Every structure is written in C-alpha cells, then in structure tokens.
Design a protein around this ligand. Structure first.
Ligand SMILES: COc1ccc(Cl)cc1NC(N)=S
Length: 209
C-alpha cells in the first residue's frame, strides 16, 4: 500500500534548483549525507545514556558506504536514531520549509550551493547526483518505512517489507547516468578524506565484487 504526497511548494522549488542549476562541485552531497548520519548517531547515543534499552535494536554505531555498479546505486547506511512516519511526512518538511527560505535568500545574496547544510536541508543535495532517492528507515518507536522521490513535486511512503534494519537509516542514491564516478572506490575515498575525515563514527567503504 503506497501513499503519494506533494512536496510543499518551497521544497519542490529547492529540488528544482538543485537539479537544474549548473554547479560542478557535486561531491558535497556525500559530506552532507555523512553529516546527517553522524547527527542521527549522536541522537541515539545521547538518548541511550539515560535509557540504555534504546540500543536493544542494535549497539553498533557506524556508517557504511556501499556502491553497487550493477544497480548504479550508492547507499549510505547508518545505525542512528532513524525516522518515524511523522518525521518523513510532516516534521522534516516543517523544518525544511524555513531552512529552504533562508537558503534561497542566501543564494541570491551570493552564497553557493555548498553551504546548503548550514540551512538544515543538506539531504536534498542528493539530487545533485541522483535521479531517484530511496530512504529506508526504522525508528525504535515506529515501523520500518520506505520513502522515495524522483522529484517532480511528489514523494511516496510505504511500509517496507525488505530486510529488517533493526534501527537507523539507509539512503539509496540511484545515480544519474553521468555521475557513476561516485561508485569508484578511489573517488569515494578521496571525498571522505577531504570532507569527512573527523566524523566520530567508523565509516566503512565497502568494495565491489
Ligand atoms: C526523507 O524526507 C526528508 C529528508 C530530509 C528533509 Cl530536510 C526533509 C524530508 N522530508 C520531507 N517530507 S520534505
């Protein structure tokens, strides 16, 4: 059972800008997604200090980067706090509305796309390199969900029947045809070393068979 939702007009406008603006420094998408993963891991770690049972869904706190050339996907997996259905539909969109407004004002003032993360909407930098983004997520207080959007103003949410994740978030980037450099081990290593060297969780770059 698949539910389809309209983005708020402001978020749709942000995604069109990210997809249509000429901007060569696309590699920042990975810094933004790793930063999001790190924040989600910080959140479950802090919550576990006062409620250790919050880690019953998994004690390991880590980030995995998984390229797949056959499917042309780059997957960023974290075992962070995860997202509820309400997060996916309502709460994140509310935060993203004000962040988008601010980011658009800054861009017109002369900022560039690489400061997107300062405005809380760095997730959408995924559309610099992905034609479709799928997000599988599991929060301790909710079911496992799959969120998906190819932009165009709408996204879907369904209950996920895939492999149970325990807790956390999987961002699956279905890469644009001309962005397959981000499936290359040496390219991902280069980007992580440049932008994410001090993230406080182990980042494992999987290699391909
Ligand atoms: C996975 O969904 C999101 C991820 C990041 C942000 Cl900032 C917002 C959303 N959601 C919306 N409904 S706009």
């Amino acid at each position: 059972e698949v539910e389809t939702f309209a983005f708020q007009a402001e978020i749709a406008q942000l995604m069109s800008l990210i997809i249509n603006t000429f901007y060569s420094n696309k590699e920042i998408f990975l810094r933004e997604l790793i930063s999001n993963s790190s924040d989600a891991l910080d959140k479950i770690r802090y919550e576990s200090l006062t409620d250790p049972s919050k880690l019953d869904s998994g004690k390991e706190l880590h980030i995995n980067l998984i390229p797949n050339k056959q499917d042309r996907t780059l997957t960023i997996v974290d075992t962070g706090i995860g997202m509820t259905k309400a997060d996916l539909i309502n709460n994140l969109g509310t935060i993203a509305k004000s962040g988008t407004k601010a980011f658009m004002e800054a861009l017109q003032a002369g900022a560039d796309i690489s400061m997107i993360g300062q405005f809380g909407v760095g997730f959408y930098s995924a559309y610099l390199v992905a034609e479709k983004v799928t997000v599988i997520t599991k929060h301790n207080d909710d079911e496992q969900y799959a969120w998906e959007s190819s932009a165009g103003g709408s996204f879907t949410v369904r209950t996920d029947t895939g492999e149970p994740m325990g807790r956390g978030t999987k961002v699956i980037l279905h890469l644009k045809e001309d962005q397959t450099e981000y499936l290359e081990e040496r390219r991902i290593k280069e980007i992580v070393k440049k932008h994410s060297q001090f993230i406080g969780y182990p980042i494992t770059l999987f290699v391909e068979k």
